[PDB]
Amino acid sequence: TNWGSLLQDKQQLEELARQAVDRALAEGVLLRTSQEPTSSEVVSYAPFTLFPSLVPSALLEQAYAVQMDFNLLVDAVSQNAAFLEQTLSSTIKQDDFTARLFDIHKQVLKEGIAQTVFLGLNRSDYMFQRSADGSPALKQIEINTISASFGGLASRTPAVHRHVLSVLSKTKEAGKILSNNPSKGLALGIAKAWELYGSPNALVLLIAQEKERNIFDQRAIENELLARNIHVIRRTFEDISEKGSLDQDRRLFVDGQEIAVVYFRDGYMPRQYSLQNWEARLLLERSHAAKCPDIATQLAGTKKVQQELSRPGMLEMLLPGQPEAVARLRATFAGLYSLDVGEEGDQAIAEALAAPSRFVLKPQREGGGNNLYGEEMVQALKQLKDSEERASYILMEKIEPEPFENCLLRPGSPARVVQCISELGIFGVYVRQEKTLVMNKHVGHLLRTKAIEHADGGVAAGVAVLDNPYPV
Amino acid sequence: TNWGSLLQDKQQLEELARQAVDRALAEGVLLRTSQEPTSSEVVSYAPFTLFPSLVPSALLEQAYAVQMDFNLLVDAVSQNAAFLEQTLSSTIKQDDFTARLFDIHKQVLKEGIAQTVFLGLNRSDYMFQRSADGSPALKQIEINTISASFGGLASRTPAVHRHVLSVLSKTKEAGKILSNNPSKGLALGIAKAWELYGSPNALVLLIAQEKERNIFDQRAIENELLARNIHVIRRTFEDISEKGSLDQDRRLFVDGQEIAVVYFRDGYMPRQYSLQNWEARLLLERSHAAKCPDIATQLAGTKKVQQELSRPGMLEMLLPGQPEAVARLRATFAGLYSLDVGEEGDQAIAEALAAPSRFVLKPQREGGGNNLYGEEMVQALKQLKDSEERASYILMEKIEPEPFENCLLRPGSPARVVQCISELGIFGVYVRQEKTLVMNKHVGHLLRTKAIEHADGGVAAGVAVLDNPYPV
Ligand SMILES: Nc1ncnc2c1ncn2[C@@H]1O[C@H](COP(=O)(O)OP(=O)(O)O)[C@@H](O)[C@H]1O
Ligand SMILES: Nc1ncnc2c1ncn2[C@@H]1O[C@H](COP(=O)(O)OP(=O)(O)O)[C@@H](O)[C@H]1O
Ligand SMILES: N[C@@H](CCC(=O)N[C@@H](CS)C(=O)NCC(=O)O)C(=O)O
Ligand SMILES: N[C@@H](CCC(=O)N[C@@H](CS)C(=O)NCC(=O)O)C(=O)O
Ligand SMILES: [Mg+2]
Ligand SMILES: [Mg+2]
Ligand SMILES: [Mg+2]
Ligand SMILES: [Mg+2]
């Protein structure tokens, strides 16, 4: 178990790190370099821990047992239009980006949805909260419903931790690492959706920007598709505007080829959309191809929607008659507070101002680097208290897991032995034809770990690194 | 079959190349960059063809059916001391490098061989000669008995060619690519040798320079060892001099750890040895650890020894009573000429001077970039004719295979559609305890291809790229 003990001897560290890095590159745990995000002529290893972080087996089991419930929940939200408008009514007057996303959802609702096949590829993230007894409890940090990444690379890292332990003759521990293959499962969902669309020669369209350091993780899904004779074409929103078009039955065509599924790897942040990219996203949502996620499902992944769902009776109204599901889901909720104009918002603000190390302030963003904490959160709250703008955020109880030592490897920086905390993610996959759920599953996990000084996180954002859960 | 047809459309080429490269990096077909040969912080794909080159199945079968014979042959040569001294008697007065190798072999013979376990990991290379009928015939180019590389990377590229064909929906052709796993087999030989040495905690010592772009191909063998709980330590000759020592029973110790097998990845060229590296190689050959190859076996891989073995009755005297083996081996020999002082040497020189595009002039070197052809060969022959120095070389019939179009991918250069020729290699593995052959096998193949303008070759030397034999 204890890694700290293996991290005190320096010559041995340098050697195990050398071992890990070479095995990681051989297993395909790669990213393009930051200096040339459009080129695969040169690449490096994605950041990762030297050893797999210990994770309570019961919590890992618990995270897995609630994924099917969260896939149901996200899918009920995306279909209940009144819930989404009421939930986001205040956010959309203050947040341009949520307004545009919501406005596409509205135009689409208006014209009628062309698509008849629906699917979600997501990742639900949790932390381990020290509880009353002392028992760590599984608490949800967020749910990611657009461009849920790192499932390809995560299938490749276990071999890397087994290797590091083998070098030290810890064959027992090496043997306990869990094998994990999420990209197979994510791919199977797009496969199912393609099958159901029903056009033998239609392609899966992957939406990605040209500067994309994480191409290998996307290629992994493409490899699993390609093995089942489903072809993917990669294109940017700009490409869609120049070459995407709808036929008479609203079929999407790209370069004359028919698209069955639109898998988004881009478009979860405002910086990714110019005026024309917004038209291309509307164009894709208006089409008959299955969308991954469709625009409503992307709205279901907002932090505001997450906060609303914790209010008593909210789970019950979305998943009526499903009390055990309701319970599994609710056990994972930590404190979530609306900051809308009103008494509840005023109270949450006063609590955050009184004990700022215990809350996080979150805008309706995705992908890391956008939440506010401690000093910045305090300063922002003091300006937001009296502004309508407050409605663009939500406030949340900070989980503060017990820190454990590990060693982080990131290209270009020396191996770093430090106190770290992890975040456990479970990938979910579901597909529905009209209103019948045809596939609903969990497909694997992702443990992301970071050095203790980072309030925020995310691998693509440069903070957390890839890891594997060592069951204890 | 015909690749030329898929190489005429430019937008599609750029796209299949992009596909191949990304799949190649994901499968671990890597080299460190040339600018930082000591760092794995950044890497690229090893050069490779876009499609697998067509290879006559009968010749590929033939190359495989003679490997066990060549392993026997190389092993008989390394044990027959009179043959080696007589063969190399003239070379050693003119070639310092062969003199030093030979001198270590002599000192070791003198002190008596400490080692009791012997093994060879090699690669026998052939080209396809247009023959009388028109039928291509398998002809040996050389046999590589020291640092026989690219067996790890070759286990990884088939998935890459299957991918490229799959993208084009040629599932039939993709299905014909042969799976290949030489590093498993090479590793099994060092494993056998370690087993036989018999010390549970002794390590396999890999001799490699610090600047080594091909580390991943070496790590592949280390991975297979590590999976069988055999540990490898990587060290340079300089490290051996500073920290290697022999005990009383001539046991090799490195940093206090006992070495069972010495696997050479360096030391096949004079530039790799300073005066102290020469002492370290002698020190390792004097030891009780199994050597891969041992110094005599390295001498058995010289081009001069190859030339001598083609003389009538020479195979017969090395492998007495083995006529079918003799025949399989002899069928692969092309014309080989001694250039020693004397009538035969004068005649070969006159033939080479009369038709220089048909011969190659070879020094006793290894690894590519050292032979002489056409203009340089002619100029060298005119100076060597009357010199004692002529004995440092041998002359050989050039094989001129039919060229076929393929596309070569090399990092930093645009995909290049060109006429190419291939070289088929078969990896051999054998182990012997005292005088009993305990393992003798072929373990996989390596197809190396190059653009037609290159007289010479080799992947590490920058000319040939990795490929796969498409059986026709
Ligand atoms: N409630 C929380 N307790 C602890 N850390 C949190 C909490 N909320 C957010 N974070 C930290 O910030 C990171 C990013 O926040 P997140 O809610 O997941 O939004 P994003 O969609 O930007 O990832 C998390 O992975 C975690 O490191
Ligand atoms: N006899 C030959 N016919 C054709 N090409 C040859 C011949 N001999 C050498 N070469 C070319 O030069 C390369 C290097 O020669 P080789 O004999 O294999 O020595 P090295 O040990 O340097 O590889 C070969 O892979 C091939 O491209
Ligand atoms: N361009 C990347 C990044 C997308 C991204 O960061 N996705 C978020 C959901 S919005 C996530 O899964 N990131 C995980 C990680 O960064 O830790 C892609 O498709 O890989
Ligand atoms: N440093 C390299 C290069 C050694 C080398 O070039 N080996 C030769 C035998 S001397 C060979 O197999 N080379 C094949 C290739 O370059 O095509 C190593 O261990 O990989
Ligand atoms: Mg997150
Ligand atoms: Mg998120
Ligand atoms: Mg050669
Ligand atoms: Mg050679």
From Swiss-Prot, chains A, B:
Pathway: Sulfur metabolism; glutathione biosynthesis; glutathione from L-cysteine and L-glutamate: step 2/2
Pfam families listed in its UniProt record: GSH_synth_ATP (PF03917), GSH_synthase (PF03199)
Residues the entry annotates as binding substrate: 123, 146-149, 212-214, 218, 265-268, 448, 459-460
InterPro entries in the record: Glutathione_synthase, Glutathione_synthase_a-hlx, Glutathione_synthase_C_euk, Glutathione_synthase_N_euk, GSH-S_sub-bd_sf, GSH_synth_subst-bd, PreATP-grasp_dom_sf
Result when mutating residue 284 to Q: In CNSHA6; uncertain significance
Main function: Catalyzes the production of glutathione from gamma-glutamylcysteine and glycine in an ATP-dependent manner. Glutathione (gamma-glutamylcysteinylglycine, GSH) is the most abundant intracellular thiol in living aerobic cells and is required for numerous processes including the protection of cells against oxidative damage, amino acid transport, the detoxification of foreign compounds, the maintenance of protein sulfhydryl groups in a reduced state and acts as a cofactor for a number of enzymes. Participates in ophthalmate biosynthesis in hepatocytes.
Subunit structure: Homodimer.
Disease per record: Glutathione synthetase deficiency: An autosomal recessive disorder characterized by massive urinary excretion of 5-oxoproline, metabolic acidosis, hemolytic anemia, and central nervous system damage. Anemia, congenital, non-spherocytic hemolytic, 6: A mild form of glutathione synthetase deficiency, resulting in hemolytic anemia. Affected individuals do not have neurologic abnormalities. CNSHA6 inheritance is autosomal recessive.
PANTHER family: GLUTATHIONE SYNTHETASE
Official protein name in the record: Glutathione synthetase
